[PDB]
């Protein structure tokens, strides 16, 4: 015999803190966005808890994994969990499960570990609803516009890498650290749940000016670190732009390409 636990993950604006909801309440998150792609592990902490209930403070050391999941488009994951489980000596007991977030959405803090005993109070549909709190964190962005220095018109197709003070270069990955194919223009790290990593120059992500000259990204952690945009692919007939120091301060600024001179 199992109970269905439905976990729903909602993001609110930075200074809005949702009221807790009981397990028997179906809440639509009025005022929030569902958070997709958030990874959880559910630990079977029955044995840890029943070793000494009054001393239990959320340890999942040595606890078996009861399930793993990832939130879908509705911010949800659903898992059927046995309402009874064995303690360490093999005696059956009311099951206890601990929910541990292993991979938050880009732009969000992780939620705190929580745990519950089954059977839990269920809503009218028989499901047990939990709503872990993911607080939005401030992140920063930067946009560049590539232009022809002489005409001042926007220039498409110019390639750049971004370096930090250690001489490492930015490579975007997906939520699991795998390579992604990054196209032209401004890269919405937050919308795609990407990650910023720092690697050798030859493994770095190339950012490319689009038809409006634009490139850049969001999802930087701070606005105090200095990075450098370095030209790597120069449109034929131009001289390479000079390196551009910047901070992720949410600004747009221009990068100029001088037409190469032809003398007589």
Numbering used by the authors: 39 to 302
What does the paper say about this structure?
As the first reported host of “non-pathogenic-derived” pili, Lactobacillus rhamnosus GG is a gut-adapted commensal lactic acid bacterium (LAB) and one of many clinically investigated probiotic strains for human use in the prevention and treatment of certain gastric ailments. As with other Gram-positive bacteria, sortase-dependent piliation in L. rhamnosus GG (called SpaCBA) is assembled from the ~30 kDa SpaA (backbone), ~20 kDa SpaB (basal), and ~90 kDa SpaC (tip-located) pilins. Two immunoglobulin (Ig)-like subdomains comprise GG-SpaA, each having the conserved residues of a canonical E-box motif and internal isopeptide bonds formed between either lysine and asparagine or lysine and aspartate residues. Our findings show that the GG-SpaA structure has certain features in common with other pathogen-derived pilin-proteins, such as the Ig-like CnaB-type folds and the presence of internal isopeptide bonds6940.
In D295N, the E269 was also substituted to alanine (i.e., double mutant D295N/E269A) to see its effect on isopeptide bond formation. Interestingly, this additional mutation did not affect the isopeptide bond formation in the C-domain. On the other hand, the E269A-substituted and E269A containing double mutants (to a lesser extent) displayed a minimum peak at 202 nm, suggesting the glutamate residue in the E-box of the C-domain might have some role in maintaining proper folding of GG-SpaA. Concerning the temperature-dependent CD spectral changes for the double-mutant proteins, D295N/E269A appeared comparable to that of E269A, whereas for E139A/E269A this substituted protein was lacking any obvious transition points with a rapid reduction.
